[PDB]
Ligand SMILES: CCCCCCCC(=O)OC[C@H](COP(=O)(O)O[C@@H]1[C@H](O)[C@H](O)[C@@H](OP(=O)(O)O)[C@H](OP(=O)(O)O)[C@H]1O)OC(=O)CCCCCCC
């Protein structure tokens with residue numbers, strides 16, 4: 280938050296343990312600037328300025344150009360803290376003490392009960408309903424006739440693929456996915 | 462500056478004696494916000510949303526609405542410091558020990574020499590050229606035929622009034638003023654009624670400027686109101702006026718046409734009756750003149766700017782016909798935007 | 802005025818009146834000169 284005074288000695292690892300000056304305002308400035316540049320380049324793509332092909336190219340790379348611009352802006356402002364992308368160190372499980380890469384269907388530390396083996400069908404039905412509705416409505420949205428899609432779309436192959444890879448990835452202790460609308 | 466650590470116990474009188482957190486970033490946010498709101502309300506005026514009359518009203522008050530919104534935004538952030546408007550404490554001379562309200566022409570503390578009584582003409586000459594050029598060029602710009610002013614403009618009465626009032630105010634230890642370009646253009650634009658893209662009429666009246674002058678005089682007694690108005694909101698307002706004052710300038714339009722392909726070029730006489738490269742040569746000569754004037758303004762010899770600006774009249778009247786045909790000059794340099 | 806000021810023979814109204822009178826005189830002189838020319 281914006282305060283008159285801050286603590287100039289604040290622990291930085293893993294995340295700041297207290298408020299920091301200029302953080303929220305610079306975050307707002309970077310967000311607003313990124314959105315502004317993205318929209319200005321989107322307008323410039325449809326505009327009538329410069330060679331049209333260059334404008335189409337420049338406007339095609341509008342989002343990467345805005346990202347690069349504001350990333351450079353944050354790069355040159357080194358005194359102010361901004362939260363960055365945090366990616367895991369390596370290709371290892373998040374908990375090396377709780378599970379491995381492969382999950383035993385009969386249990387890791389306790390024997391899996393038989394009743395829940397048949398009682399997993401209801402959560403599976405709920406997950407199937409969620410994934411089905413999300414993926415198929417997304418496919419409907421992207422394959423509308425007004426979107427000028429000529430190559431066709433798959434409502435049976437895509438659902439089979441998505442839910443099958445989800446079921447297979449469940450065995451490896453990994454999330455099942457779905458076709459995300461946005 | 463933005464720095465990792467700040468001193469928290471800094472003295473706050475009469476102004477920051479050191480760096481403060483969140484100040485520059487909040488100034489940037491306030492300026493961008495008020496500029497964005499002003500431009501959004503300007504587009505709302507010309508938009509097709511809401512009852513049109515309400516949209517026209519809301520759009521007319523667009524700058525006051527933006528100012529109020531950002532003033533409230535800074536009001537509700539109490540911990541952060543932003544520089545506010547400061548007015549004098551009262552209607553007193555700015556330095557009590559140096560002079561009074563009235564200045565004796567023969568001297569205050571020492572006798573004024575005789576030779577300077579005659580030698581004051583040359584600085585008076587320079588001031589007269591400055592004020593004359595600024596005021597008459599502002600009158601020319603504001604009272605253009607394309608601006609739809611039917612009430613007439615007087616080039617002799619206004620110059621006499623401005624210079625005589627300045628000369629009288631000099632006797633009272635007060636500055637001589639001039640008809641500024643940006644403020645007058647903004648004032649005329651704020652009174653312009655748009656048609657259904659095309660100028661329809663301007664509300665030419667004496668009450669708006671009179672009320673502005675009265676409020677400027679009363680600003681000393683409006684300290685509790687002005688002390689809560691940040692300078693960043695006014696900076697965004699200034700940016701709005703600067704980008705707005707370029708609407709009716711054909712030089713700006715042709716500079717845009719430099720970045721704009723010819724097929725796109727609009728249906729205007731200096732495009733349809735002049736070759737594109739000739740038009741761009743015209744624009745480039747004007748750009749060279751602008752660069753020369755900017756350079757002159759950057760030197761300490763910036764008071765010679767009126768004379769260098771005057772030199773652009775022999776340019777257009779002599780050197781331009783030596784490289785441009787009369788048709789091209791009529792199309793490009795048109796008094797009332799006519800196709801010769 | 803303010804503080805300690807030199808006392809001249811003429812006050813401020815007197816000196817400004819004499820300066821306005823001199824200015825009116827020279828203005829009338831130039832006007833009469835211009836009226837004399839462009840006629841003869
Ligand atoms: C930047 C490159 C040009 C620099 C100098 C400019 C002079 C220069 O190098 O000539 C090339 C060209 C001139 O325009 P020119 O009419 O030759 O070319 C048209 C121009 O490329 C349009 O943008 C195209 O529109 P779009 O494809 O339909 O969308 C149009 O395609 P189409 O209608 O035929 O299909 C083209 O025909 O440049 C500009 O675009 C002018 C402003 C450029 C910006 C100047 C500011 C640096």
Ligand SMILES: CCCCCCCC(=O)OC[C@H](COP(=O)(O)O[C@@H]1[C@H](O)[C@H](O)[C@@H](OP(=O)(O)O)[C@H](OP(=O)(O)O)[C@H]1O)OC(=O)CCCCCCC
Pocket residue numbers: 509510511512513514515
């Ligand atoms: C702020 C109002 C709150 C909504 C209250 C809900 C009530 C409400 O406002 O809607 C009904 C009413 C319909 O009345 P009506 O159609 O007669 O009113 C038209 C409207 O004023 C247009 O803006 C005018 O065009 P312009 O711009 O002057 O050129 C047009 O005149 P003209 O030029 O065509 O001859 C007017 O005829 O308004 C709307 O137009 C719909 C916009 C809804 C406004 C919704 C905005 C959020």
Ligand SMILES: CCCCCCCCCCCC(=O)OC[C@H](COP(=O)(O)OCC[N+](C)(C)C)OC(=O)CCCCCCCCCCC
Pocket residue numbers: 280281282307310311314490494534538
């Ligand atoms: C594309 C551009 C989009 C613009 C959107 C702006 C969103 C603003 C987000 C702040 C809102 C908020 O909630 O601020 C509230 C904050 C923090 O909350 P707190 O309760 O103090 O935190 C305490 C929580 N603990 C318990 C975790 C510690 O207070 C402040 O320090 C006030 C700062 C507000 C500044 C507003 C910035 C300018 C806004 C207008 C710009 C035109």
